[PDB]
Design an enzyme around this catalytic site. Structure first.
Site, PDB file in Angstrom:
ATOM      1  N   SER A 241       0.824  -1.206   0.000  1.00  0.00           N
ATOM      2  CA  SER A 241       0.000   0.000   0.000  1.00  0.00           C
ATOM      3  C   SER A 241       0.860   1.259   0.000  1.00  0.00           C
ATOM      4  O   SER A 241       0.609   2.194  -0.770  1.00  0.00           O
ATOM      5  CB  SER A 241      -0.948  -0.011   1.200  1.00  0.00           C
ATOM      6  OG  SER A 241      -0.235  -0.159   2.414  1.00  0.00           O
ATOM      7  N   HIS A 271      -1.916  -8.730   1.920  1.00  0.00           N
ATOM      8  CA  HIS A 271      -1.407  -7.519   2.550  1.00  0.00           C
ATOM      9  C   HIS A 271      -2.252  -7.049   3.724  1.00  0.00           C
ATOM     10  O   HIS A 271      -1.720  -6.874   4.826  1.00  0.00           O
ATOM     11  CB  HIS A 271      -1.293  -6.393   1.508  1.00  0.00           C
ATOM     12  CG  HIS A 271      -0.713  -5.122   2.049  1.00  0.00           C
ATOM     13  ND1 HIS A 271       0.036  -5.077   3.206  1.00  0.00           N
ATOM     14  CD2 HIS A 271      -0.770  -3.850   1.589  1.00  0.00           C
ATOM     15  CE1 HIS A 271       0.414  -3.832   3.435  1.00  0.00           C
ATOM     16  NE2 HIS A 271      -0.061  -3.068   2.469  1.00  0.00           N
ATOM     17  N   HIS A 317       7.916 -13.711  13.272  1.00  0.00           N
ATOM     18  CA  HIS A 317       8.445 -12.544  12.586  1.00  0.00           C
ATOM     19  C   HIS A 317       9.613 -12.945  11.696  1.00  0.00           C
ATOM     20  O   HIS A 317      10.379 -13.856  12.018  1.00  0.00           O
ATOM     21  CB  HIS A 317       8.910 -11.482  13.583  1.00  0.00           C
ATOM     22  CG  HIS A 317       7.854 -11.052  14.551  1.00  0.00           C
ATOM     23  ND1 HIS A 317       6.524 -10.941  14.205  1.00  0.00           N
ATOM     24  CD2 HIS A 317       7.933 -10.704  15.858  1.00  0.00           C
ATOM     25  CE1 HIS A 317       5.830 -10.542  15.255  1.00  0.00           C
ATOM     26  NE2 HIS A 317       6.661 -10.391  16.271  1.00  0.00           N
ATOM     27  N   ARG A 326       3.231  -3.410  19.499  1.00  0.00           N
ATOM     28  CA  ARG A 326       1.842  -3.102  19.177  1.00  0.00           C
ATOM     29  C   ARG A 326       0.908  -4.198  19.676  1.00  0.00           C
ATOM     30  O   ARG A 326      -0.225  -3.917  20.083  1.00  0.00           O
ATOM     31  CB  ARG A 326       1.688  -2.900  17.670  1.00  0.00           C
ATOM     32  CG  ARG A 326       2.514  -1.747  17.116  1.00  0.00           C
ATOM     33  CD  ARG A 326       2.353  -1.623  15.610  1.00  0.00           C
ATOM     34  NE  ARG A 326       2.836  -2.810  14.911  1.00  0.00           N
ATOM     35  CZ  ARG A 326       2.690  -3.022  13.607  1.00  0.00           C
ATOM     36  NH1 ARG A 326       2.067  -2.126  12.854  1.00  0.00           N
ATOM     37  NH2 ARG A 326       3.161  -4.133  13.058  1.00  0.00           N
ATOM     38  N   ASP A 372      -1.446  -7.948  14.313  1.00  0.00           N
ATOM     39  CA  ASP A 372      -2.660  -8.503  13.727  1.00  0.00           C
ATOM     40  C   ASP A 372      -3.225  -9.684  14.504  1.00  0.00           C
ATOM     41  O   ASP A 372      -4.368 -10.078  14.251  1.00  0.00           O
ATOM     42  CB  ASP A 372      -2.388  -8.919  12.281  1.00  0.00           C
ATOM     43  CG  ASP A 372      -1.915  -7.762  11.428  1.00  0.00           C
ATOM     44  OD1 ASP A 372      -2.597  -6.715  11.415  1.00  0.00           O
ATOM     45  OD2 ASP A 372      -0.851  -7.893  10.787  1.00  0.00           O
TER      46      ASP A 372
HETATM   47 CL   LIG Z   1       3.438  -5.922   1.804  1.00  0.00          CL
END
Ligand SMILES: [Cl-]
Ligand SMILES: [Cl-]
Lengths: 437, 439
Positions: A241, A271, A317, A326, A372
Site C-alpha cells: 500500500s 497484505h 516474525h 503493538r 494482527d
Molecule cells: Cl506488503
C-alpha cells in the site's frame, strides 16, 4: 503557536537541502547488489524506497521518527482524561519529526473536522452502491470521487512551479484525511446498518469522530480507536500500500488517486487482511475447544497445526526478534478493560504457550506475535463484528503515514519511480553474457 | 473447432513456469546490476526491477511484442474483413501466448468479449450520476473498481481455491473486464462531452468497432484508426508507472479490477499519460503563432526558437530508440492514405520533414526522432475526438491489454509479492558511512 503547515514549511527546506547534499556527495556509493533471484522474487531485500516516517527496529519494534511504541505512548499528547495517544498527534510527528503540544493537536483536530463535510455527489454515490460491493472497493471509489476538489490538480494545470507542489499536496492531504472517518462510517452504516450517520462534532478528535458516526458514544470504544488508528499509521515504505501510493504519487497524481491506489493494494489478501485471518482461525479454534483454554488443550491444538504444515496466524516474525510492542499495547488494553472477555482469554492463552511450542517445533526463528494477532478481538468486543470492514479501518489509519510521505516527497521533489523491465528471454541473454565474461 | 485463448494458454504457461523455475534455481545468485545511492533517491532509474514478458524495447527496431516489431504485427496478425489494420484482440492473444492466432480464433475471441460487455446497472447508475467536472480518468477507474462485485477471483479466493487455480479466475475476470472497457469509456464520453445517449453493443463487431460505435460513429475509417490506435498502445514494457502499479497491486492478489484501476490512476498522472495532449497543446500554439504558415523557413525558425529557449520539441527525442518510432510511421502512413490534405496533419508532416535536422544541428539531442505521441492526437482530432481530457482514457482502453496479459501470467507462474526494503534518510546515511569506512 505554529500550525502544522507553518512548522513543516520551516523544516522541509532543511531536509530537501540535506538530501541534495547527501546524494551529491555520496550518490555513486553502491548500497546493494541486484541478484537475479531478487528481481524474480519481488525485489526482496532490495533497498528501493526512501521512507522517513517509520523504520523497523529488529530489537525494539517499529519506530516512528526514532520513537518506539512506548516512546509515543509517553510523549504524544492525549485527549482529556484519556491514556491513549492521538493518531493526529502521530501524524504531526511523522510529517515534522517533532512532538506537538497539546494545543497544536487540538487545533489540528479542529482543522481536520472543518474539512470533513462530504460533497453531495459522494454521499449520493455511496448511498446507491450495492451492499455486495466490498467496503474496500467502496472506500477507494469514494476517495477517487473527491478528485474534483483536488487543489493540487488545479495547481498543476495552472502552471504552479515544482517547488510549490507541497503546499497544495498538503491541503489536499488534510482535506482527504478530514473526510476519511466520514467515508468509512457512511460505508459501515449503509452496508451493515440502517444507513443513518450522525453529525461531526467539531470538538471531537479524529478517532472520536469515526466512532460517533459509526454509532457509539462509548468512551472506551473511542480510546480503542485512538490506539488502533495510531499503531497502524505507518510501517516503512516497502509494503504494497505504501509503495503503491508512492508510485502513483511519483507521476504527480493527486493525494486522492495516490491514496485510492494504495487502498486497492491494502485490499489485497496477502497484505491487508491479516486481522481477519487471525480471527477466523480463533473462531475455528474456539468451536473445538469449547471454553477450554488450558495449557494442554491449546498446546495440542498448536502442535497439530504446526505438524500439519499450517502456521499459527499472527505469529512468527521475519526480522523482529521479540513480541511486537503493538501486540503488547493491545494486550494491556484488553487487560484494563475486559480481562474476562472469552475471546480475549483465548488469545491470552495462546500467547502464554505458543512461543514455547513454536520454539520446540524449531522451524520459527522469532516465535512472537504481531499487531494482527490481537486487533480483531478488541474490535469484536465493541460490536465491530463484520470482518469485511476491518481493512477499511486499517486504511483509515495507514493513510496518515501514506500522506505524510507523499507531502514530503513533493516537498523535496522526488522523481518518478521508473525501473527497467526485461522479459525472461532477455534476462537469460543478460545472464549468459555476464557469466561468460 | 480450434482452441480458445484459455485452452491454448493453459498448455503454454506450464512450460514457461518450469523454464523460469530452472533459470532462477541455477542462475539466481548471478549479479545483474548494482544499486547506487543516487538510484534509490532517483526513482530506481536503470534498475532491473520488473519481469514483463509481453513487450521489450528494441533500441534499433522499436518496441517488440513477443519479438514482433510493428511491421511484423501489421503483416502477421489477423485483420477485420475488408480492413488492412491489425486487431487489438489479436495482439492480446499474442501478448499472452507468444503465438499468432488464426482469423477464426480472433473472431471467436471478439465475440466472447462482446458477450461480456453488458455493464451492470449499478455501474450505469454510478456513471450517470457522477458530475461532469469529475475528470474522465477518475470516472474511468471508479467504474472499473465498481465492477469488483462481479470478481470471480475474489469470490473464488474467499471460497478457498488452490494456488494452482488462481490464474483461471484471473483470466475470466480479465476477459469480463476487457469486454466492458469500451462501454465504460464510451458512456463517459457521451455523459461528459455529449448528450449522455449511447447505442447498443453489436455482438458481431470487434473491440475497436464497439468503442467507435458507442461513441457515436459508424465511419469505417474511424473504426480502422481505432483498431490501429488500440493495437500500438497496448503494451510497452513493465517499468512504466501504470504497468508497474498494476503488477504491484496484483502481486498482493487483488483482482484485475482493483489492479487495473490502480494502474489507471498511475496513468492519470501528468508525467505518464499526457504526452499525447502535451504534443497537441504545443501543436495548437504553433498554429496560432505561425498564422497557418507551414513553410520550411517558418517552421525551422519556430523550432530553433523553442530549442534556444531551453525547451524541448514535444514528442521528439528518444533516450534509447535510435530511429523514428515505427508507431509514428504507422500513423503517418494512415494519414497519407485517408486525409493528406488535412491542415493539422500538414503541420505534423512539415515538422517531421525538418525537426530531425534542426535538432541535430542544435547538437543537444542524441536521437532526434518522433515517438508515437507526436502523431496520435492529430489523427484523433480529424474524426471529431477533440476533447483532449479524454485521450488518457483511450490510452487506458488500449494499455489494459498488456496490463491484463501480464497479470494473468503473474498468477499462472505464481509470481511473488513485490516488497522492497525501505530506509529513512538518517538510516541511509549510517548505511553509506559504514560502507565507505570499509572501502
Ligand atoms: Cl506488503
Ligand atoms: Cl512511466
Amino acid at each position: 503557536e505554529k500550525t502544522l503547515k507553518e512548522r513543516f514549511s520551516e523544516i522541509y527546506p532543511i531536509h530537501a537541502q540535506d538530501v541534495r547534499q547527501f546524494v551529491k556527495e555520496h550518490g555513486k556509493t553502491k548500497i546493494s547488489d541486484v541478484l537475479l533471484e531478487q528481481v524474480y522474487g519481488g525485489m526482496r531485500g532490495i533497498p528501493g524506497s526512501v521512507w522517513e516516517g517509520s523504520v523497523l527496529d529488529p530489537e525494539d519494534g517499529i519506530r516512528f521518527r526514532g520513537r518506539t511504541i512506548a516512546d509515543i505512548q509517553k510523549d504524544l499528547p492525549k485527549a482529556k482524561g484519556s491514556s491513549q495517544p492521538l493518531p493526529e498527534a502521530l501524524f504531526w510527528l511523522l510529517l515534522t519529526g517533532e512532538v506537538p503540544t497539546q494545543a497544536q493537536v487540538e487545533n489540528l483536530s479542529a482543522d481536520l473536522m472543518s474539512r470533513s463535510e462530504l460533497p453531495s455527489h459522494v454521499v449520493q454515490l455511496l448511498d446507491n452502491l450495492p451492499k455486495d460491493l466490498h467496503p474496500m472497493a467502496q472506500f477507494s471509489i469514494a476517495v477517487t470521487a473527491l478528485e474534483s476538489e483536488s487543489k493540487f490538480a488545479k495547481a498543476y494545470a495552472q502552471g504552479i512551479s515544482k517547488q510549490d507542489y507541497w503546499s497544495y499536496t498538503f491541503e489536499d492531504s488534510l482535506d482527504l484525511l478530514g473526510k476519511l472517518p466520514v467515508i468509512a462510517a457512511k460505508i459501515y452504516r449503509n452496508v451493515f446498518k440502517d444507513g443513518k450517520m450522525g453529525e461531526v462534532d467539531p470538538n471531537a478528535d479524529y478517532a472520536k469522530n469515526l466512532v460517533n458516526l459509526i454509532g457509539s458514544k462509548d468512551e472506551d470504544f473511542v480510546d480503542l480507536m485512538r490506539l488502533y488508528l495510531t499503531i497502524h499509521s505507518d510501517h516503512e515504505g516497502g509494503n504494497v500500500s505504501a509503495h503503491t501510493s508512492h508510485l502513483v504519487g511519483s507521476a504527480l497524481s493527486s493525494p486522492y488517486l495516490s491514496l485510492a491506489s494504495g487502498l486497492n493494494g491494502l485490499a489485497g489478501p496477502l497484505h491487508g487482511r491479516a486481522n481477519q485471518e487471525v480471527l477466523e482461525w480463533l473462531f475455528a479454534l474456539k468451536e473445538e475447544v469449547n471454553d477450554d483454554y488450558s495449557k494442554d488443550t491449546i498446546e495440542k491444538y498448536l502442535w497439530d497445526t504446526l505438524n500439519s504444515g499450517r502456521v499459527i496466524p499472527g505469529y512468527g516474525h521475519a526480522v523482529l526478534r521479540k513480541t511486537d510492542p503493538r501486540y503488547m499495547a493491545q494486550r494491556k488494553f484488553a487487560m484494563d478493560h475486559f480481562p474476562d472477555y472469552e475471546l480475549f482469554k483465548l488469545v491470552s492463552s495462546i500467547y502464554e504457550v505458543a512461543p514455547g511450542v513454536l520454539t520446540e517445533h524449531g522451524k520459527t526463528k522469532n516465535p512472537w506475535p504481531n499487531v494482527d494477532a490481537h486487533s480483531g478481538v478488541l474490535l469484536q468486543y465493541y460490536g465491530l463484528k463484520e470482518s469485511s470492514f476491518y481493512t477499511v479501518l486499517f486504511g483509515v489509519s495507514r493513510a496518515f503515514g501514506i500522506l505524510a510521505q507523499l507531502i514530503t516527497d513533493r516537498a523535496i521533489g522526488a522523481s518518478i519511480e521508473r525501473p527497467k523491465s526485461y522479459s525472461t528471454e532477455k534476462y537469460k541473454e543478460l545472464v549468459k553474457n555476464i557469466e561468460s565474461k
